[PDB]
């Protein structure tokens, strides 16, 4: 951020329903996302499983 003001980043993690779905998209069976700055960080682990049909 070389700008004069604060930046708000919106991002996400995908939780697939089946392992097949995981691999069909990402290859690797277990994905992961780490979004960070100098003084803070978030690591989200996606979780494969079923949720109500929506």
């Amino acid at each position, epitope marked *: 951020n070389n700008d004069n003001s604060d930046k708000l980043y919106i991002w996400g993690v995908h939780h697939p329903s089946t392992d097949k779905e995981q691999t*069909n998209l990402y290859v690797q069976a277990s994905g992961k996302v780490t979004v960070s700055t100098k003084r803070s960080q978030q690591t989200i682990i996606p979780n494969v499983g079923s949720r109500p049909w929506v």
Partner: antibody
Amino acid sequence: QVQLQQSGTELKKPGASVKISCKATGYTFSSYWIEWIKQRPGHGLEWIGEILPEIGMTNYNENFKGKATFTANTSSNTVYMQLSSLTSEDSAVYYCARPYDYSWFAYWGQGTLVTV
Amino acid sequence: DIVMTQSQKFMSTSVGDRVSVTCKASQNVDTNVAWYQEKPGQSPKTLIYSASNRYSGVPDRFTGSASGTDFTLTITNVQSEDLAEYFCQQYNSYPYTFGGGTKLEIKR
């Protein structure tokens, strides 16, 4: 045994559109991509694109963008490809294929001939 | 895009003899390459994957190999039922691309 059943032969006037179907049987329908391949008598094999049925994610070859549209009926275990604005260039045999799991092709359909 | 070049449009061989089709990727596909056999009027059938690996139900005659970007499909002891067109495919990255195809011919 895994089977991909495509639709009948098709004849279409130039400028019209066509919907070809691929009916998947003998495996869990949602666990695999469905691929579409075009064959004209002297261009060999061109890859149209793929669709992942559950979430309806479609991935097209840059060259077919706007020509081809995939859709999926999860209840009928069927994948449809739609070709629009047909020209003679689109006259070919169209195959649908299922990967072994995520990449290379294992199972093929019997082909659908489309003449324009 | 990645080009898969099969420079041989037609091959000549005799039954029982040995024949090799070459395919050259135009940039690294690693070992992800498949070989398919299209007989006249039928749908393509799967021969090889991972460039060296025999798909189930495929006779031991057909063997794939790879060195660098060079991929070779070798049939030893060619039979008469082996008359067909041979396609190679790089499944390494999108878009998937194919070779021009090589028609196997039995000459004399």
